[PDB]
A paper describes a structure:
Combining established techniques in cryo-ET and sub-tomogram averaging (Huiskonen et al., 2014) with direct-detector technology (Bammes et al., 2012), we improved the resolution of the TULV Gn/Gc spike structure from 36 Å (Huiskonen et al., 2010) to 16 Å. The spike complexes extend 10 nm from the 6-nm-thick viral envelope, and the membrane-distal region of the spike consists of four lobes of globular density. Consistent with the previously reported TULV structure, we observed two types of stalks linking the membrane-distal globular lobes to the virion envelope: (1) an elongated peripheral stalk that links diagonally to the membrane and cross-links with neighboring spikes and (2) a central stalk located at the center of each tetrameric spike. Computational cross-correlation-based fitting of the PUUV Gn crystal structure to the segmented cryo-ET density localized it to the four membrane-distal lobes of the spike (see Experimental Procedures). Fitting allowed identification of two alternative placements of Gn (fit A and fit B, cross-correlation coefficient 0.90–0.92) in both of the non-equivalent membrane-distal lobes (segments 1 and 2). Fitting of the PUUV Gn crystal structure into the membrane-distal part of the hantaviral spike yielded two types of solutions, A and B, with similar scoring. As these two fittings differ in the orientation of the Gn, we used additional functional constraints to discern between these two possibilities. Analyses for both of these functional constraints support fit A, as summarized below. Indeed, in our preferred fitting of PUUV Gn tetramers (fit A), we observe that the C-terminal regions of the PUUV Gn protomers co-localize toward the center of the tetrameric spike and likely contribute to the central stalk density. For our preferred PUUV Gn fitting (fit A), we observe that the N-linked glycans presented by the Gn extend from the tetrameric glycoprotein spike surface into the solvent-accessible regions between spikes.
Hantaviruses, a geographically diverse group of zoonotic pathogens, initiate cell infection through the concerted action of Gn and Gc viral surface glycoproteins. The ∼1,150-amino-acid glycoprotein precursor is encoded by the M segment (Schmaljohn et al., 1987) and is co-translationally cleaved by the cellular signal peptidase complex at the conserved “WAASA” sequence (Löber et al., 2001) into two structural glycoprotein components, Gn (∼70 kDa) and Gc (∼55 kDa). Low resolution three-dimensional (3D) structures of Tula (TULV) and Hantaan virus spike complexes, derived by electron cryomicroscopy studies and combined with biochemical analysis, revealed that Gn and Gc form square-shaped oligomeric complexes on the virion envelope (Battisti et al., 2011, Hepojoki et al., 2010, Huiskonen et al., 2010). Here, we describe the high-resolution crystal structure of the antigenic ectodomain of Gn from Puumala hantavirus (PUUV), a causative agent of hemorrhagic fever with renal syndrome.
Residue numbers in the entry:
A (entry chain A), C (entry chain A): 27 to 91, 102 to 203, 209 to 291, 301 to 381
B (entry chain B), D (entry chain B): 27 to 91, 103 to 203, 209 to 292, 301 to 382
Write the structure that this text describes.
């Protein structure tokens, strides 16, 4: 039994906050990954979006005798954290709970990371409940916070700044973000990879057309944070940490550079990365930055290219976990 | 001097809540019971209903050589016979209900005094005095030890806001008063039929009583109407009533089965019960379930039949005190 | 040097309060009493009313061989506590200070009691200052209170009830009252002795026509309290304590009953009392209750009749000091 | 890093008050003084007046064999030459004044930085940085230790509300700035005449300077105009100025009497003073009292003549820091 801890605040407050928790489970063989279904015994209202079938290009490597053979094909996965637009943003109002997983994989095995997001009211209704994923049971524990006004962060009770203007103590908090595909008809407002390129590039990249955004939750509970929100200091912070740690923040053995075709029907290579063996470390899921219409990739045993300074064959991860410093008061 | 504690909340809140408290006094001889009058020195607006004259059949037993029972019609005053709507609208009318029930053996009665009223009394009043016969009762209004809930067996507990459909479980006190209320057609007020259905008993016909219970939960709440089908608490109270028909706020020595005529003018027996001696334990007041028009009974030294599985000669108690489990949150 | 202590509150508050203090001085011979003038070096605005000439009937006794010879005459005194209507009541607004004395006398000597009443602002302007009376110097000391919300009473900090409605701790406080002559054209609203008679009499007195009232200060500082104010619990309390202790509340040797003519031009006796010797105990000043127009009396060596149960030949004292219980909070 | 403390009151109150603080920095060489610029990283609205170019006569002395003095006209920036109305209306305009005065010997100057501004700065700002040449200044806004007054030599003191006509006495700091202000006819602005009358000196004619002092009392106050006849504090400040014309915020070795030409184009001497060496003690800036149009002087290593009993060749200082006794109430 794994443990997914939810830190519950003393009050609901302004209505629009969500709780979030997550746990990384033990390794399962690859052949079992396509069968994985999240089950819930919990007394909450599961959003059905994530358990539908979702098309991915599977990209894999084998030793050959540069010394690699890669290949790819299109398959359907279910239960992954591909959250539709507005679902997280309006979950406090709809009273919907999002439960989904990401995959961190080597060639032969995957560690699912289960994410649970939902309304703060769940803390009134629920002390503990169970999720299942394949053969693993997950104990969700809702636990009331030691603090009076904030959250337990690095063993310290902390409340961040709230005002919209400019004016403190500084505490480093966890941020968890989910990639959302969202197109507009006209212009470049949703061209997410262009935002990264302005932050970390010298010269002009021609074709990074992916349209979407990240939706993030800060700490154990917060209102959703949209990335990018141009004049928000927290958005700026998350983007900068993403730009320097594109596979998130926290033995794996690097073998070499690999390329491949995504989707597999492409005549030439559209993706690159670094093949590895040993313990999976980063998530193995992302989207090509080059296509407006998302091309989703699952690349077990390969760290797909996420360096924003590169122009071609790069990706954005489906989920991203890191840390940002927040100004506020320790109490 | 007895002590009647009122637990006062920090705020009035949504306006319709009432405070309630109650105390059981020492035994008084039976001959003094017909003279008992509640006096008040308190700065609140007493509802006058309960101090009017109210006709009861008095049913008593004597050893013979075996039992001899007898009955007669008398008038009592001050008992908890609350008219319809009085408790339900007390928060709006600003009326205070003060009345007693009687728990009696053959020779003595312990009055239980009940005080119910608007939460505003907590602003106007720290302490005041009630008198009953020769006993003085100190009413003490005290702010609650809890932040938001109520002190329940030494624990601060806040119950869920009551929802129809959909953390901690605490057993809380419920106090209920029987209200006689007729409607012109149908069975919506046939309270004893509700009990019969629950105890799986469909053959009865002495179940024409029309009325309901009005209850307060803990030390303060809004009134709870029994039965209300879509309130989970109503279902709980009815079960608890069905299992403990004489309440559970509680040596008493059982002697045997007795019957009698209520009212005394009946040609055959209309009531049964169990004669006892020793310490009065349960209340000695109720109504026959068989008559649409209430026949009120005072039966000192007899536990009147309240088992809902029986069809004939049974009764409903005038007041009922018991306990139900509530879901909620225990403070800190 | 005598000491007149003023207890100063922390704030002025609602504007209309006055401070009061008083001290009883040592005995002076009678011949010196007619010369007594209050002098002040204090930085406050003295009301001039009390230092004007004021006609009194002097009533005195001598042993003779019932065994007494009494006599009387009309004389002018100055500086006594004969305060005009409205002066105390509006002193907080006018910023006037009242300084005057009453006399407590035996046949040969008088102890003046000096009263000082004035605006609470004096506590900002003044730490100490000097009054003189004949050959005595009086040190007025303004001292800031130990308490946060109330006054030091019996070594305890106390704040009385403030609301106009009915609802506590109970503390006994000093009350000091001054008799004010005030006539109306029509009716019995100002017939002060009639109020006493209703409280303490069996049958009907014919002729107690004095018109006036008492103005009182409670503790070391308060707003003026008018006696009688019919629906005020404090007025009721003061009147009852007056009725049971008509010469005030706190060795003197009683000799016998005496009568006399007030004013001295009366053909028959209009006043009675009890002759004494030894240490003066009560004040020796009052007014006849019988006359609408005040007949002021100074009766050294005689306790003038103040028993309200009597109908004829009785008086009201010019000043009155006693104690009443107040409901409130000790803190 | 130097420290400029601002004592912040609990409330803003009647709207027209300003906070003031000041700090004297370490010595800097003379050659660097003409390059000194105040920089600010603070979140307040700096008034631009004081950072403009301002013409001064520089008057200096050298040993000879006896003294050789000389003078020339130069432009300084950043000095406390505040225009009329700027301090007086700063609470309404929300402008902050930051400037320095100079206290100099022949070879080095200690700048004294003054910061004056609206009390609202206390809401917006806990700390910020000023720079002057190579020195950093930490401005620290700190809530007052007192309930209502100000910390004066380790004692909490609240002065009387100032009344014209009519408890404790505390000596408080006053800081004043000289303001040049002409009027078209009469002697209402002839500041040096006011001083002359007070020191009993009616024969003088080099007293045509027109202007006044604007002062702040303690760590915060409303501006005080000197002279204001019906303000008791004005009378006190003028006396204190007359007795200590170079202030009293304060080894210095006196060498002798010197004279010079201000401006340098004058054919005869128009200024005198006392040459010194060692630690600069007083400020080295002022204006000639003789000219209606201000002639500003910077005299490093010379205490310019400020004795009001003298008629000719005298000056008024640009800033003045001293102490006056105020009536009020010491807290607890
Ligand atoms: C992808 O990652 C997975 C998980 O990180 C990884 O598979 C695992 O590898 C470890 C070690 O290589 C396996 O560990 C074994 O566990 C059994 C359980 O009883 C042990 O008995 C074994 O012990 C023997 O082997 C050791 C060899 O050094 C000895 O030290 C020891 O004394 C014993 O002789 C053994 O350690 C584990 O079972 C798998 N896990 C899974 C889920 O299959 C995998 O290697 C990674 N893939 C690649 C291609 O890198
Ligand atoms: C009216 O009241 C006044 C004041 O209360 C009163 O006059 C005072 O009387 C006392 C005692 O009768 C006088 O006391 C005297 O004081 C001098 C001062 O030095 C003493 O030396 C005297 O001492 C001798 O007398 C005593 C007699 O018993 C002895 O015990 C003693 O050892 C000495 O021999 C003496 O006590 C006081 O001076 C006057 N005060 C004034 C102000 O005149 C007066 O008696 C009262 N009048 C009436 C008519 O009752
Ligand atoms: C009806 O109930 C009442 C009250 O419970 C009973 O009266 C009580 O009876 C008990 C037991 O007989 C008496 O006990 C005695 O107490 C005295 C104290 O004065 C003691 O000295 C004796 O040794 C004895 O234990 C008690 O006095 C009495 N109490 C009162 C308040 O009257 C009564 O017995 C019951 N009646 C029946 C018919 O069972
Ligand atoms: C003008 O004032 C400045 C500053 O007060 C004077 O400069 C200082 O002069 C003193 C005394 O001559 C110097 O003292 C020396 O300090 C050093 C420390 O490095 C010490 O090692 C020596 O033994 C000695 O005591 C000091 O350095 C110097 N300070 C600065 C900040 O420059 C200057 O003398 C004055 N000029 C005139 C003409 O009086
Ligand atoms: C991210 O991508 C850029 C571009 O490929 C890499 O930048 C080059 O790095 C090498 C060695 O650090 C330098 O010698 C080159 O001059 C860099 N080129 C440019 C255009 O910047 C960068 O190192 C990559 N970051 C990684 C792999 O972490
Ligand atoms: C309530 O009344 C019913 C009906 O009279 C009682 O049921 C009887 O119980 C005994 C013991 O279990 C059985 O031997 C009888 O056969 C039952 N009779 C019927 C008709 O059901 C029941 O005991 C009563 N409950 C009490 C006294 O608590
Ligand atoms: C106040 O005056 C009344 C009336 O003169 C006194 O009352 C009389 O007192 C005596 C003895 O106490 C009784 O025997 C009389 O019956 C009373 N008469 C009346 C009419 O009440 C009273 O004692 C006086 N109070 C004093 C001197 O303190
Ligand atoms: C201020 O200037 C006056 C006027 O020059 C000085 O007064 C002289 O003081 C000395 C010593 O007391 C006397 O011997 C002179 O006769 C005074 N002259 C005049 C004209 O009054 C005074 O000393 C100066 N004050 C200072 C330097 O503090």
């Amino acid at each position: 039994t794994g443990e997914l801890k939810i830190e519950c605040p003393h009050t609901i407050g302004l209505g629009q906050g969500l709780v979030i928790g997550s746990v990384e489970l033990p390794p399962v063989p690859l052949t079992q990954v396509e069968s994985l279904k999240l089950e819930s015994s919990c007394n909450f209202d599961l959003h059905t979006s994530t358990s539908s079938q979702q098309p991915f290009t599977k990209w894999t490597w084998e030793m050959k005798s540069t010394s690699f053979q890669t290949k790819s094909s299109e398959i359907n996965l279910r239960g992954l954290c591909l959250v539709p637009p507005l679902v997280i943003e309006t979950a406090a109002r709809t009273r919907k709970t999002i439960a989904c997983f990401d995959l961190s994989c080597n060639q032969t095995a995957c560690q699912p990371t289960v994410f649970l997001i939902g309304p703060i009211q769940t803390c009134i209704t629920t002390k503990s409940c169970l999720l299942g994923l394949g053969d693993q049971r997950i104990q969700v524990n809702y636990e009331k916070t030691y603090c009076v006004s904030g959250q337990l962060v690095e063993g310290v009770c902390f409340n961040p700044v709230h005002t919209m203007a400019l004016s403190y103590d500084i505490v480093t908090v966890m941020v968890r973000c989910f990639l959302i595909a969202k197109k507009v008809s006209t212009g470049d407002s949703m061209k997410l990879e262009k935002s990264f390129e302005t932050l970390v590039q010298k010269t002009s990249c021609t074709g990074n057309g992916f349209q979407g955004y990240y939706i993030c939750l800060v700490g154990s509970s917060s209102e959703p944070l949209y990335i990018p929100t141009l004049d928000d200091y927290r958005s700026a912070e998350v983007l900068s940490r993403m730009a320097f740690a594109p596979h998130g923040e926290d033995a794996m053995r690097i073998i070499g550079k690999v390329t491949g075709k995504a989707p597999s029907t492409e005549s030439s290579d559209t993706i690159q990365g670094v093949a590895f063996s040993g313990n999976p470390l980063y998530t193995s899921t992302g989207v090509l930055t080059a296509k407006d219409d998302p091309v989703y990739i699952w690349a077990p045993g390969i760290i797909m290219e996420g360096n924003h300074s590169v122009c071609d064959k790069k990706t954005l991860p489906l989920t991203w976990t890191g840390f940002i410093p927040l100004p506020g008061e320790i109490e």
